[PDB]
Design a protein around this nucleic acid. Structure first.
Ligand SMILES: [Mg+2]
Ligand SMILES: [Mg+2]
Ligand SMILES: [Mg+2]
Ligand SMILES: [Mg+2]
Ligand SMILES: [Mg+2]
Ligand SMILES: [Mg+2]
Ligand SMILES: [Mg+2]
Ligand SMILES: [Mg+2]
Ligand SMILES: [Mg+2]
Lengths: 131, 441, 118
RNA sequence: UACCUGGUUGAUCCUGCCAGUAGCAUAUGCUUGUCUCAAAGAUUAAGCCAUGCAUGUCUAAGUACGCACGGCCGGUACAGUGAAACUGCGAAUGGCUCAUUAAAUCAGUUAUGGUUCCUUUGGUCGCUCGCCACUUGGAUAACUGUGGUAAUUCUAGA
RNA sequence: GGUGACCACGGGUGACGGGGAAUCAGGGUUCGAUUCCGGAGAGGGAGCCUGAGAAACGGCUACCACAUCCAAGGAAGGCAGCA
RNA sequence: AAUGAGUCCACUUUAAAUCCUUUAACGAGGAUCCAUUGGAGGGCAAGUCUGGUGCCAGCAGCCGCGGUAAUUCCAGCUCCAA
RNA sequence: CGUCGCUACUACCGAUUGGAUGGUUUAGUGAGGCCCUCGGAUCGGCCCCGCCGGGGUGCCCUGGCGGAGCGCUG
RNA sequence: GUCUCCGUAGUGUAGCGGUUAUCACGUUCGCCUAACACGCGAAAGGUCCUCGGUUCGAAACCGGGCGGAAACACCA
């Protein structure tokens, strides 16, 4: 199998990231990160490939005042890929999924990180390109 | 050239039906190497790696997600002797009606039986399906079948002679009660996932000499499942009887419209002739006839044909209908019809009035007993008692029935495959019957 | 994807090719179509590599520099035979044309000559 | 065919509308023996389309050394029938639809002495003083051969 | 400077224009997507090669929206033509 | 006595058919080879008929009908319009 | 005749710096084509002329290898 | 096809593995009135969508099938 390695997170609670799928939502506002035990005063932060709980601030009115599971696919914070490559993207992006991992939308705009693609096959299926 | 038959693979859950079917397809020039490589890639991406051969027929998203066969699927592969396309079983009591639909529309049957420790015993039980599939295959009109022994490398020790002999004996002792002759029914030990004893003689299994069958038409004796498929006797195709098509599924293909796919039971279907559907009573003209991505000018009985009818929507004609020629005598709605049900397993008493679900050919419509006419002996239609108050397991009876939902049936004398039906209640098999008389509207 | 002379890169580019550049024949007059073409620099990522030998080596490579294949049909213009056979001016020009002898099994023997032009 | 009738009131004259009446033009319901014409996915979606066809073309009179046939009349450039291909022409007509469009399109009238025009037809083509002309040069098709890609009416080298 | 209560300008149209159609004392009132003429368009825009004639789309290029195949490296689309 | 609507030979038509017109031979006495659609208070032609229902069901473009003797509903008959 | 009480139906106002779908545009970015100014991956001619050659008689009519004139040019 | 929820007098619909009940009506219904109306009196009315399993017995504990009510997929 193989588990995901540690990467630089750079997206704490409260970050507003783009919504890269065609669900009609424009951005995702991160409220928490899955799998975070915690630490006093430490903000839960997420990297690419992490499940987060997010609410959309602008977009279709039927998605706004709800909490959606989301997965980060791109991030601006540079992270190491265990082979000396420090990679970062042009923007922070995520897609809206369910707790089983399948996306609510059907297409993804822009590249998707290899860590996110390898750990979510359903997101990797709809990714136009993988970085 | 080539003659057309049809085969179901029947067996227990998790016994390797879809995997064996798909890998047998792959051996017989079914699909190229890179597409199944992509299928294995997707299976490894999710995790169900061993289900890669199952993905050839289990194409739906739900089936691929759960690793559970839900709906019937079709695939074609040409063999050494003649053409054949294969039916994949769901293998579940949840989709027992899907299984009834699949095995009602068939010529031959493959009884895949697991050989590993534990799975075989779970298959042959009160909660198992190995009894159920064979019993309803005999009920719906499948005469000649084969019993296959799968997952031989799974059992401990692998490739054992004693295990296979025990499996053959245990299957025989009950299939003789079902009705099939084990002398005519071939027994083949196979391994779908490994690809063992499918196309070429085994090298990890030297103890298996070869199965033998003793039929009146012909004697056959081979080493693999492919030659065993080749030696299946051709069915008697009733071409002169009027055209009848129990409908499998409906599809709305872009640019050709709604093309009902069903089996020619009797008669011959050709492009350019008007048809009538029995329950909905809608008349329409057939544009063209095709099968398995290939066109036909004529459709012989025992063939899976897709034909394009004109100016009917997908909602108007749904799964479970009967199609027929309008020029000849067409199938009309059955307001009531008298059938000869034999009670197999039912703990409470059978009175006139309760509602089991009844399965004529493809469809599934629950019916209500109006009154029980005569108590009849177990065979030959021998009259025993007049107007019984109640019935009980282990007895036959002639009964008149009133379906609650619209449904069409035909007599066993005119069209033998239409006459076959079963009865289901209490999530089990409660009666087996055939229809002799029918009233129209 | 074939290579085009003058691309001056390694890899694939897209070029709006009109009539008579390379790697393109127009379906109708005036038609230009954008097509993918490989650059002129050759590297590891090729399938084939057309080469033309400029000068002969010291020995004969088998199957290529032996059993020379003749050009099928000779010149058709009168000057193009006069320069080939060193004619000065109108010396039996009709007869110095090349005659093509063709033989088949059912064919009755016959020689073939071209309609000499100009 | 320049036409009215019922309804406010206990009853009467009015105003006045409602309703009735007749035609055509869309749909729909019922019914339907013959025959002659004949509209027909405009109204909602100028929404989306599988498949198949809808634009190609040679005379004596541009270029045939394809054997793909064939007269040879037999010592000859080319008999002739002609695939393919080059060349020339057509593909800007026809057909469909009515979304846009309110002095815009369009209708009648008038001008281009303010412009262009394939083809047809008719003029003009010795009007010019100025070492191949008994005919000049090169390339490329078709064709042989070596291939590449999973693919295309994709093409490279020789 | 030019145009406006002789209705400019702006908006709407369930507006392509006309020859015409229905109704019919006379006068009129409605309808003309529809075979003839003229115009526009070819999924929405835009830019072009060829050719005498095209801003052509059963020609090309680019973007957008759909959407076909794929061995995922690419390739190919336009029925408001006849069905 | 006369005819078709239909079966149907041939001709004709037509690129080839089809249809029409010809023309053989069958083809009518419930000539069962069966005309329907709407109405019968008024407007508006046609029943103060009969049986049910009983302000219910329903009819009725409008006036209006129906609460146990309905010229208006539901049916039969008989009439009216095309 | 009106208020009040109940039940329906239809619109009106109304915080929500409401919401959705079209249309027209400022500004920024901006594919692609066309034009202009460059550019020169290649393909040809002349000067060929290291030479054998050469004929009107070392003075070539040129029938080919070959360097390359390392220029002039399209 | 795959999942999520709802489905009990005619409706309003409480409910408890030992009881599907009541309420507002709706109706019927003695009760008046020519008829209303207006009040007066009583009732009936439930397979818990439906069929099973579990259980000493279940509407309900569990599971199916049916219909609705939301999605999600569904291309010979
Ligand atoms: Mg703190
Ligand atoms: Mg010439
Ligand atoms: Mg021209
Ligand atoms: Mg318009
Ligand atoms: Mg018009
Ligand atoms: Mg026009
Ligand atoms: Mg145009
Ligand atoms: Mg255009
Ligand atoms: Mg009457």
């Amino acid at each position: 199998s193989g588990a995901k390695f540690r990467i630089s997170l750079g997206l704490p609670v409260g970050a507003v990231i783009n919504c890269a799928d065609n669900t009609g939502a424009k951005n995702l506002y991160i409220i928490s990160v899955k799998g975070i035990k915690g630490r006093l005063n430490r903000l839960p932060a997420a990297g690419v490939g992490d499940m987060v709980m997010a609410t959309v601030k602008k977009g279709k009115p039927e998605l706004r005042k709800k909490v959606h599971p989301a997965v980060v696919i791109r991030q601006r914070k540079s992270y190491r890929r265990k082979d000396g490559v420090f990679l970062y993207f042009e923007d922070n992006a995520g897609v809206i999924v369910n707790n089983k991992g399948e996306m609510k939308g059907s297409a993804i705009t822009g590249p998707v990180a290899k860590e996110c693609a390898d750990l979510w096959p359903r997101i990797a299926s709809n990714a136009g390109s993988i970085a | 050239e080539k003659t057309h038959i049809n085969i179901v693979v029947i067996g227990h859950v998790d016994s390797g039906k879809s995997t064996t079917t798909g890998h047998l397809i792959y051996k017989c020039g079914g699909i190229d190497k890179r597409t199944i490589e992509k299928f294995e890639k997707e299976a490894a991406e999710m995790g169900k790696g061993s289900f890669k051969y199952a993905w050839v027929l289990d194409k739906l998203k739900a089936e691929r997600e759960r690793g559970i066969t839900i709906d019937i699927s079709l695939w074609k592969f040409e063999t050494s002797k003649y053409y054949v396309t294969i039916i994949d079983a769901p293998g579940h009591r949840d989709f027992i009606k899907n299984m009834i639909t699949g095995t009602s529309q068939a010529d031959c049957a493959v009884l895949i039986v697991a050989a590993g420790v534990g799975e075989f015993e779970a298959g042959i039980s009160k909660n198992g399906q190995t009894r159920e599939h064979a019993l309803l295959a005999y009920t719906l009109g499948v005469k000649q079948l084969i019993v296959g022994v799968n997952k031989m490398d799974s059992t401990e020790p692998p490739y054992s002679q004693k295990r296979y002999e025990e499996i053959v004996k245990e299957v025989s002792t009950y299939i003789k009660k079902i009705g099939y002759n084990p002398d005519t029914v071939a027994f083949v030990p196979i391994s779908g996932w490994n690809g063992d004893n499918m196309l070429e003689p085994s090298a990890n299994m030297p103890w298996f000499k070869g199965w033998k069958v003793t039929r009146k038409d012909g004697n056959a004796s081979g080493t693999t499942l492919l030659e065993a498929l080749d030696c299946i006797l051709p069915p008697t195709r009733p071409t002169d009887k009027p055209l009848r098509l129990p409908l499998q599924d409906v599809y709305k293909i872009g640019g050709i419209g709604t093309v009902p796919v069903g089996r020619v039971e009797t008669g011959v279907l050709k492009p350019g002739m008007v048809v009538t559907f029995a329950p909905v009573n809608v008349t329409t003209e057939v544009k063209s006839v095709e099968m398995h991505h290939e066109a036909l000018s004529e459709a012989l009985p025992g063939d899976n044909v897709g034909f394009n009818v004109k100016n009917v929507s997908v909602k108007d004609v749904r799964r479970g209908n009967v199609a027929g020629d309008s020029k000849n005598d067409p199938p009309m709605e059955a307001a009531g019809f008298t059938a000869q049900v034999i009670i197999l397993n039912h703990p409470g008493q059978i009175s006139a009035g309760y509602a089991p679900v009844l399965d004529c050919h493809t469809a599934h419509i629950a019916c209500k007993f109006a009154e029980l006419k005569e108590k009849i002996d177990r065979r030959s239609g021998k009259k025993l008692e007049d107007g019984p108050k109640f019935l009980k397991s282990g007895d036959a009876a002639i009964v008149d029935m009133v379906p609650g939902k619209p449904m069409c049936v035909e007599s066993f004398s005119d069209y033998p495959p239409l006459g076959r039906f079963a009865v289901r209640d209490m999530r089990q098999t409660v009666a087996v019957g055939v229809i002799k008389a029918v009233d129209k509207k | 994807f074939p290579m085009k002379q003058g691309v001056l890169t390694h890899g694939r580019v897209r070029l709006l090719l009109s009539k008579g550049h390379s790697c393109y024949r127009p379906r109708r007059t005036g038609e230009r179509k954008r097509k993918s073409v490989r650059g002129c620099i050759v590297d590891a990522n090729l399938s084939v590599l057309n080469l033309v030998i400029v000068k002969k080596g010291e020995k004969d490579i088998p199957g290529l520099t032996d059993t020379t294949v003749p050009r099928r049909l000779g010149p058709k213009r009168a000057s193009r035979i006069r320069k080939l056979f060193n004619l000065s001016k109108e010396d039996d020009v009709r007869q110095y044309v090349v005659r093509k002898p063709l033989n088949k099994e059912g064919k009755k023997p016959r020689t073939k000559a071209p309609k000499i032009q100009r």
